[PDB]
Design a protein around this nucleic acid. Sequence first.
DNA 1: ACAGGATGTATATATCTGACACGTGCCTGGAGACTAGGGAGTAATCCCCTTGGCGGTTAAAACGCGGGGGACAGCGCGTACGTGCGTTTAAGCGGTGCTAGAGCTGTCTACGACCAATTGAGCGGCCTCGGCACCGGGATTCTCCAG
DNA 2: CTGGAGAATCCCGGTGCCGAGGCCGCTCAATTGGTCGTAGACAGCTCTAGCACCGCTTAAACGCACGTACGCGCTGTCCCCCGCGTTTTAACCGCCAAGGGGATTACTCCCTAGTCTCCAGGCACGTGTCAGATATATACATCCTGT
Lengths: 98, 97, 95, 95, 85, 84, 110, 110
Amino acid sequence: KPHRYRPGTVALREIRRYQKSTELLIRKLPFQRLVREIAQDFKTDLRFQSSAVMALQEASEAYLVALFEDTNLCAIHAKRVTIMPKDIQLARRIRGER
Amino acid sequence: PHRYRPGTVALREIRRYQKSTELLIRKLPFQRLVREIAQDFKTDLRFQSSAVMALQEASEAYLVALFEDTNLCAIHAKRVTIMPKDIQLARRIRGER
Amino acid sequence: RKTRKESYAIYVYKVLKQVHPDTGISSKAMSIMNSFVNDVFERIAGEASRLAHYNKRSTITSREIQTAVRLLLPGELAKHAVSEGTKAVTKYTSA
Amino acid sequence: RKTRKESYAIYVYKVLKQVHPDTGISSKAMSIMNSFVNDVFERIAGEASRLAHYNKRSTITSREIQTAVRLLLPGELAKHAVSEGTKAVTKYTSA
Amino acid sequence: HRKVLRDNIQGITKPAIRRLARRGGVKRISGLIYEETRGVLKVFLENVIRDAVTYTEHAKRKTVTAMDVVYALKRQGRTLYGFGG
Amino acid sequence: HRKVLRDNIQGITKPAIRRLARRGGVKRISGLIYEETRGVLKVFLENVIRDAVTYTEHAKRKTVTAMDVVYALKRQGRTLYGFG
Amino acid sequence: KTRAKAKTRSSRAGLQFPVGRVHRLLRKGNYAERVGAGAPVYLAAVLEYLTAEILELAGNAARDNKKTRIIPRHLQLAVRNDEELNKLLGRVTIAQGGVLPNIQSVLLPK
Amino acid sequence: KTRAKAKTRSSRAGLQFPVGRVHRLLRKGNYAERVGAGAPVYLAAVLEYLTAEILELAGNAARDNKKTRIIPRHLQLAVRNDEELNKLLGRVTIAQGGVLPNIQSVLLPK
DNA sequence: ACAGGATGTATATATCTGACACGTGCCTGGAGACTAGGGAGTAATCCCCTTGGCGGTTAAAACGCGGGGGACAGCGCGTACGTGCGTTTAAGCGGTGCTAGAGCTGTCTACGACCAATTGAGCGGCCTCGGCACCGGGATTCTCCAG
DNA sequence: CTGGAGAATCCCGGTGCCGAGGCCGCTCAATTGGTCGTAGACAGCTCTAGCACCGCTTAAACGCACGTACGCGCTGTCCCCCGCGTTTTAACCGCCAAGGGGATTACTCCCTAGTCTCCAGGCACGTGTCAGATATATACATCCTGT
């Protein structure tokens, strides 16, 4: 007989796993290219220190993670377990970014 | 009978107080509340009138803003009645608690 | 007479008279405007201060002010300010 | 042949040896602690700066530092910090 | 005739809290909100007034001035225009 | 070196977003979130890099340093520890 | 010692705001060891410009409500209706300003 | 002048943090026109104290996981598990710190 | 859908007040010439990191194959608070008076920059070795699924 | 529900490494004695606001009534996102090299503090009248009933 886990078990295992570990979750090179692309519209042919790109990725993941924590609390407050765009919009409005 | 349906007079209050600017808390009770809370730091404190007024200004503006955010949280959850949990969520997301 | 305390009252009035000669202003509004001027002032000076410090320079020049303005004011508001300031700076060096 | 870039590393290590003699610290953690020290330093000095400004005084004394600490640090942290600070200043007046 | 005050927290009456919510755009208010609101406001005031007095003790003054409150507000990132500065 | 980048925003991929959410404590993610997330992140990055480069031009440098990013983060009340 | 006919630095820049006073505030304000000559002119220009920008919108607000003297309410309306200006003063509270009439759509009757 | 031997002001205050270095950073830091003699000693004492609190908590956290070298994750856990430190650092992000394990009750299986 | 009616609200008109626009008096902060130090622009160099750029390994993003719980319309019910009536109750308002501490003024002497001479704490750079990072393999728990 | 199963994670134990602790020049920042300007500490005068305090009007607040909309609990449904197999994609990882720029070292000269002085803008001090703050009576929104 086959062997499949129920929805959410592997999800929680990943939550405990990535919450226990501390490595960066975005892929280095694609993100480094996104940074350079976005930076193009301000000054042409910018060079980047390696640590500056790392600091951006670090700050980006920490910022998004915190936003998801608040988005999660908002979703739970509305008797749901699935985060939706309007939850992110609400979170940013309450915080003061939009 | 001429009893108005629930919310009509409420909306009238909303428009009425949103169109004007006077302060909504009674000056003397609030003034006493300020002095009472201040007691636990220094005895026989004196206040400038403008200070007590500035506290009422700040206080009402802070609460009004909290109710705006709270109200958005309530509406989000498909309700139209603000509840303590909504205020707690607001304060939590703002970083005040 | 007393300890004289200064404010931007007359300047707010002169600007008001250039933009709306037939419009007046209440004492409370003048207070609010004065607080606004002191606020924006302290923010710009603070940022210029940080700019001079981070780059180990001891002089706040028009460049630090400009960069500071670009950091504090959102978008087009900063651009016209930078525009006006540029005019101002240019015209000043010719007078 | 490089340029002297100072830090708080050796002091965090000395304190570390007084509090946990058998515990070490990674490079990145020492960097984080160093940034934390500069952060708290700038905050306290900033509040002391405005405190001095408001009351038109030109000297930052123990009073301003103490009041600034009470303003910035929550509860017991502040209380014990004043205890340690005052004790130390008292001891310093002897020597 | 020195006087020690008690139960002035009840001075932020229920009608006044309703009025505040009305200016905030609130349409319906549960009855349990009012006592909870007094608690919330209390914490806010506790945080602000304490700091105000903290400024007061530094200046060696016996009277809390308006400016003390303004600076207190400034300290918490809630700058207030219209009283001095 | 005359080079230009396009559509690199697709680099922040689906499994990476779901990873970020998992570290944030999210348990279930609607499919519509990804387009929303790339946009949200973009805004954030747009703001920060803009300020970063703004510091860079003031220093008359052609290379964005890590310190520029740190000061940028400080400028928005999102202070970062561990880079100076 | 009869020196030359003086004239304010604001006038040299064609400005209303006091370049000299701002310069004095800068020297005694603990911001930098020294302050450049163009800094006050540039700064005064920016402050005057922002003041004109808000006072103009305020003026329109007062005219629209049939009043000729500006009061706080018009300032609150003036700031909160300009998105960029709103952003600049997003963490500021205006005394006796009230709020903008903004009722969430779902709460209204029909 | 073949003077008395030198003692660090830190040692005079029985402190490990550099009263001398802090004092210099204050004087050249554009904070006030004058810095009182007791200010750096008092400040150094408070910085060393706060340093000891975080290090001490990180130390405990490290020992409780059988590690002798402090790495960022412990600093994160240390700061965020103390209410007053958490309140002091609510807008700060620690690089490579991660997040405190915190799963909302309603999400655990039923 | 569809008028009738009965009440808040903006409209227009009106009367004394005092807030603000303006005059006046007077005062000190802005400017102007001059001086004098030193901060940051300008040139040129070393090297070192930054970036271009090839070859292969393998982790990982991608498609899809189900499928099972999750968001959400809907129905329905029992508190519950809004509206309003009616009644205190106490704040508003004015109206007195005392006085006490803000707030300034005029004394200073104490306390912190200024200077340079000396030298020992801190750093740079460069060592060695020990937790440590990940592999190899068994056990416990953990999650799940059949009786 | 209650044991049987089967794997994911945890534990236990082993090997070269390079990150971290220590050493060794070695350089400049802390210390330390005077030394001096001047900044805030202290005594004391003025008075205005702060606070204690009386009298009445009335508007704000409190207790109730009731009923109608409001939150919230359950039920049923598509759908859609998660788990895993598979595979292509392309990032990692190492690796080579040319080099651009940045992090410096002379070198200056020019740009901004610093002083004194002159006097004109800026601020208190009144002050008078014109917006203005609320009364009196309009049709119309407007909301509800009832059609």
